[PDB]
């Protein structure tokens, strides 16, 4: 896995600022690029946390694993603190497509075993069942990184 934290050992102080209406799960990509869950942040809460330069974070809805943005992008990488100022990680809702937002609400109302009982075209059953997951998003980001490289 090309997407992994750099083992810098260079301390970096960060404010995780939840500027979303979701309970946020911070996810740290370890030195093997494997996602590690961290304590959740309620909506409209912030925390000063201890991280390191070249460490990789993404942020998800704690309950549904829906994608969230951090400083208007996918990944957050702590840098060197200048003048004892912490790095701000501003976590926001993306503008979901209306389809994805509808899939989110339907998933929140219907148990997975009952997706196939909905009066909708087969293609939408598969879309409901295609839950957001970090593993799949990391692979797309790994290809986006090599594409730019």
């Amino acid at each position: 896995p090309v997407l992994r934290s750099v083992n810098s050992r260079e301390p970096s102080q960060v404010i995780f600022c939840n500027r979303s209406p979701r309970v946020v799960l911070p996810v740290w990509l370890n030195f093997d690029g494997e996602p590690q869950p961290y304590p959740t942040l309620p909506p409209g809460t912030g925390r000063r946390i201890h991280s390191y330069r070249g460490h990789l974070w993404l942020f998800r809805d704690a309950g549904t694993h829906d994608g969230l943005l951090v400083n208007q992008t996918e990944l957050f990488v702590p840098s060197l603190n200048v003048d004892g100022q912490p790095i701000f990680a501003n976590i926001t809702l993306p503008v979901y497509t209306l389809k994805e937002r509808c899939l989110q609400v339907v998933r929140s109302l219907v148990k997975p075993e009952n997706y196939r009982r909905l009066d909708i075209v087969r293609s939408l059953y598969e879309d409901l069942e295609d839950h957001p997951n970090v593993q799949k998003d990391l692979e797309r980001l790994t290809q986006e990184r090599i594409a730019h490289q």
Partner: protein
Amino acid sequence: MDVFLMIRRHKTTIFTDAKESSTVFELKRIVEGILKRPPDEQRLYKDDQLLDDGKTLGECGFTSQTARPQAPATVGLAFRADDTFEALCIEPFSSPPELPDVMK
């Protein structure tokens, strides 16, 4: 501050924004540009309360908290046919069907 509105008469709904600071009369001008009817042939309503032409959208109760892109505030519209103004008639939207069994 931008306010986001649904201007509604009979079975017509205009989706548009304006300034919180802009006037009821200045909104009648946006309506004229789209529906080709002069301001003097227009009345605007918030619920059943007729809006005075001078008052701002802010003063009428349309703000960031009531007039949002994902949740716009309804402005009522009644036209004048020749002589006198019509009674405010906003046709409600259709009713959603009963929640499916698997969603209860």
